[PDB]
Enzyme design. Structure first.
Site, PDB file in Angstrom:
ATOM      1  N   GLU A  54       0.827  -1.218   0.000  1.00 41.99           N
ATOM      2  CA  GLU A  54       0.000   0.000   0.000  1.00 41.99           C
ATOM      3  C   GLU A  54       0.875   1.288   0.000  1.00 41.99           C
ATOM      4  O   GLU A  54       0.644   2.234  -0.768  1.00 41.99           O
ATOM      5  CB  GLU A  54      -0.907  -0.029   1.240  1.00 41.99           C
ATOM      6  CG  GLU A  54      -2.038  -1.091   1.163  1.00 41.99           C
ATOM      7  CD  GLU A  54      -3.079  -0.823   0.052  1.00 41.99           C
ATOM      8  OE1 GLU A  54      -3.006   0.221  -0.670  1.00 41.99           O
ATOM      9  OE2 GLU A  54      -3.935  -1.699  -0.089  1.00 41.99           O
ATOM     10  N   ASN A  98      -7.593   8.595  -5.925  1.00 41.17           N
ATOM     11  CA  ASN A  98      -8.380   7.637  -6.703  1.00 41.17           C
ATOM     12  C   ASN A  98      -9.112   8.263  -7.886  1.00 41.17           C
ATOM     13  O   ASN A  98      -9.383   9.450  -7.887  1.00 41.17           O
ATOM     14  CB  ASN A  98      -9.338   6.841  -5.788  1.00 41.17           C
ATOM     15  CG  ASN A  98      -8.624   6.200  -4.591  1.00 41.17           C
ATOM     16  OD1 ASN A  98      -9.025   6.379  -3.421  1.00 41.17           O
ATOM     17  ND2 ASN A  98      -7.534   5.490  -4.875  1.00 41.17           N
ATOM     18  N   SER A 118     -11.683  10.377  -4.496  1.00 43.22           N
ATOM     19  CA  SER A 118     -11.344  10.147  -3.087  1.00 43.22           C
ATOM     20  C   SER A 118      -9.788  10.048  -3.063  1.00 43.22           C
ATOM     21  O   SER A 118      -9.156  10.071  -4.111  1.00 43.22           O
ATOM     22  CB  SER A 118     -11.954   8.851  -2.500  1.00 43.22           C
ATOM     23  OG  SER A 118     -11.531   7.712  -3.242  1.00 43.22           O
TER      24      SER A 118
END
Ligand SMILES: [Cl-]
Ligand SMILES: [Cl-]
Ligand SMILES: [Cl-]
Ligand SMILES: [Cl-]
Ligand SMILES: [Cl-]
Ligand SMILES: [Cl-]
Ligand SMILES: [Cl-]
Ligand SMILES: [Cl-]
Ligand code: NA
Length: 129
Positions: free
Chosen positions: A35, A46, A50
């Protein structure tokens, strides 16, 4: 802060993530590796507008407030900025809520695509824990 592998394993364990919802410590370290590359300050936008924040790339669509994600929730009751701290407490607390939401660690797409089913214990191999 950019954690070492064993350093992060230790911090996650200290904060009670190890075997939380039945996910061994190796799963959480592997997820953080893919991540954020263990970088607490990691942020990624994103396509839906977001943003994902911190060592575990918690998404502003559901979990934290960043003030620029229309229509979103803040289920962790935190500013997304809290998720970028050198201290991982906020990220861990919020990850515990996420992993309890019904789909376990599948909430983290990188965990599903890169950690799930693999030899995740390798991630804590050699660590003093
Ligand atoms: Cl590594
Ligand atoms: Cl493990
Ligand atoms: Cl917002
Ligand atoms: Cl902006
Ligand atoms: Cl909310
Ligand atoms: Cl806020
Ligand atoms: Cl910490
Ligand atoms: Cl599960
Ligand atoms: Na939000």
């Amino acid at each position: 802060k950019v954690f070492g592998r064993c350093e992060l394993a230790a911090a996650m364990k200290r904060h009670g993530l190890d075997n939380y919802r039945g996910y061994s410590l190796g799963n959480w370290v592997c997820a953080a590796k893919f991540e954020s590359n263990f970088n607490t300050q990691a942020t990624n936008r994103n396509t839906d507008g977001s943003t994902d924040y911190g060592i575990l790339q918690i998404n502003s669509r559901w979990w934290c407030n960043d003030g620029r994600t229309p229509g979103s929730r803040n289920l962790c009751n935190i500013p997304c900025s809290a998720l970028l701290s050198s201290d991982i407490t906020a990220s861990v607390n919020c990850a515990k809520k996420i992993v309890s939401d019904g789909n376990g660690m599948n909430a983290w797409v990188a965990w599903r695509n890169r950690c799930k089913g693999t030899d995740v214990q390798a991630w804590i191999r050699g660590c003093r824990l």
